[PDB]
Amino acid sequence: IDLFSPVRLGRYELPNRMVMAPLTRNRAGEGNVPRELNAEYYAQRVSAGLIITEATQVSPQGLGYPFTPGIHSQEQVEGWRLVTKAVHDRGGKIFLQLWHVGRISHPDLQVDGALPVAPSAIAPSEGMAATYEGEKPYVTPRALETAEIPGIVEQYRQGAKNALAAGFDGVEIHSANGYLLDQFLHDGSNHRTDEYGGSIENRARLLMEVTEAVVSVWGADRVGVRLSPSGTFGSVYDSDLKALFTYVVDALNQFELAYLHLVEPTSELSSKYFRPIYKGTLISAGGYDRESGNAVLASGDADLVAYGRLFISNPDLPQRFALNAQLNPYDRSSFYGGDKRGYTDYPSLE
Numbered sequence: 425i426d427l428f429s430p431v432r433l434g435r436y437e438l439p440n441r442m443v444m445a446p447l448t449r450n451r452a453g454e455g456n457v458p459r460e461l462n463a464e465y466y467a468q469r470v471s472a473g474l475i476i477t478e479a480t481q482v483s484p485q486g487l488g489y490p491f492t493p494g495i496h497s498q499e500q501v502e503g504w505r506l507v508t509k510a511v512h513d514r515g516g517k518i519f520l521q522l523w524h525v526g527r528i529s530h531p532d533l534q535v536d537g538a539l540p541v542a543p544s545a546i547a548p549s550e551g552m553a554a555t556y557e558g559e560k561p562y563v564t565p566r567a568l569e570t571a572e573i574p575g576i577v578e579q580y581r582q583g584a585k586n587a588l589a590a591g592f593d594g595v596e597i598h599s600a601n602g603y604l605l606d607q608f609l610h611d612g613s614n615h616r617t618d619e620y621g622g623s624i625e626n627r628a629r630l631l632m633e634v635t636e637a638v639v640s641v642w643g644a645d646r647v648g649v650r651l652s653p654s655g656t657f658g659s660v661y662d663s664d665l666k667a668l669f670t671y672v673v674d675a676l677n678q679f680e681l682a683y684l685h686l687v688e689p690t691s692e693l694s695s696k697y698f699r700p701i702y703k704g705t706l707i708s709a710g711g712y713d714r715e716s717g718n719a720v721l722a723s724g725d726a727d728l729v730a731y732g733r734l735f736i737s738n739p740d741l742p743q744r745f746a747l748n749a750q751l752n753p754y755d756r757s758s759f760y761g762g763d764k765r766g767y768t769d770y771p772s773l774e
């Protein structure tokens with residue numbers, strides 16, 4: 425098995441084991457609606473065995489950065505249909521990454537200056553909010569009421585139904601990188617004393633409920649979950665990160681989702697640790713190249729290998745890797761925001 429070998433992923437037969445990782449690009453149109461430029465971009469990358477979209481908010485409440493697309497409105501459904509059609513016209517597979525930023529936002533990004541919501545009224549210790557005006561200090565978020573938790577689950581349920589209507593092949597639940605679900609999981613960011621805080625089971629409960637709701641919409645073989653055991657991004661810490669992720673990964677084996685997507689870490693909490701704990705398909709991401717991607721597949725510790733930055737600058741990464749060709753350099757300055765430049769103008773091979 426290598427990067428070029430076919431693989432089964434839930435209800436699909438993919439032609440290779442290379443995944444385009446989810447990548448926020450901040451290039452949405454009016455009302456956070458995807459646009460023709462975004463469809464071009466994903467279409468250029470269809471040689472990935474599977475594309476995961478940029479994180480996509482399930483509500484205005486759940487947005488935390490400028491110009492990110494949503495999946496809550498009919499207009500957004502119709503914008504994403506541009507993307508699904510473009511990808512499917514070229515025979516590719518695409519899953520939409522369902523997002524809620526939780527506390528990683530700012531009143532200036534919120535309608536009417538509402539506080540961001542979170543498991544607890546605890547600001548991130550580190551970093552700054554990314555507002556339309558520039559960076560600003562985070563404010564303390566508002567703790568969700570217990571009777572608000574159903575509403576959160578419904579945002580994910582409706583966003584999953586909207587993705588389905590838009591023509592995606594599936595969805596990925598973003599439970600990584602210090603966003604709302606991950607803020608629930610960590611006991612440094614979750615100090616609740618209802619059934620969504622306290623024990624590890626309780627801190628994992630919102631993720632389990634969201635996953636159950638999303639599976640009911642799509643079928644489990646069209647649903648993935650992404651987590652970050654060694655992920656501290658978003659000022660998210662926990663006393664026993666291992667045990668916490670050891671039960672969360674063991675609780676996802678009862679949902680039988682298409683895959684579990686892990687951000688790799690040095691911390692023990694790699695795919696080598698989780699392989700005997702998870703019982704499905706594993707996608708591994710973070711810092712891979714061609715050599716290291718083949719290696720992790722050779723080791724048996726992961727089934728697919730996701731690539732982020734190299735997919736930004738190499739739309740035909742799989743062919744470049746096959747032919748041992750040189751890659752285009754990536755320009756970090758145009759990762760987040762802007763126009764076609766550093767987005768759709770990186771060339772495939774001649």
Ligand SMILES: Cc1cc2nc3c(=O)[nH]c(=O)nc-3n(C[C@H](O)[C@H](O)[C@H](O)COP(=O)(O)O)c2cc1C
Nearest residue numbers: 445446447448478479709710711712731732733759
């Ligand atoms: C510009 C950029 C945007 C990203 N946005 C997302 C996102 O929307 N959702 C997510 O789960 N991770 C996001 N990530 C993390 C990547 O999915 C991925 O794990 C990382 O890029 C893989 O490492 P690599 O770039 O070394 O391949 C982002 C990373 C970068 C550099």
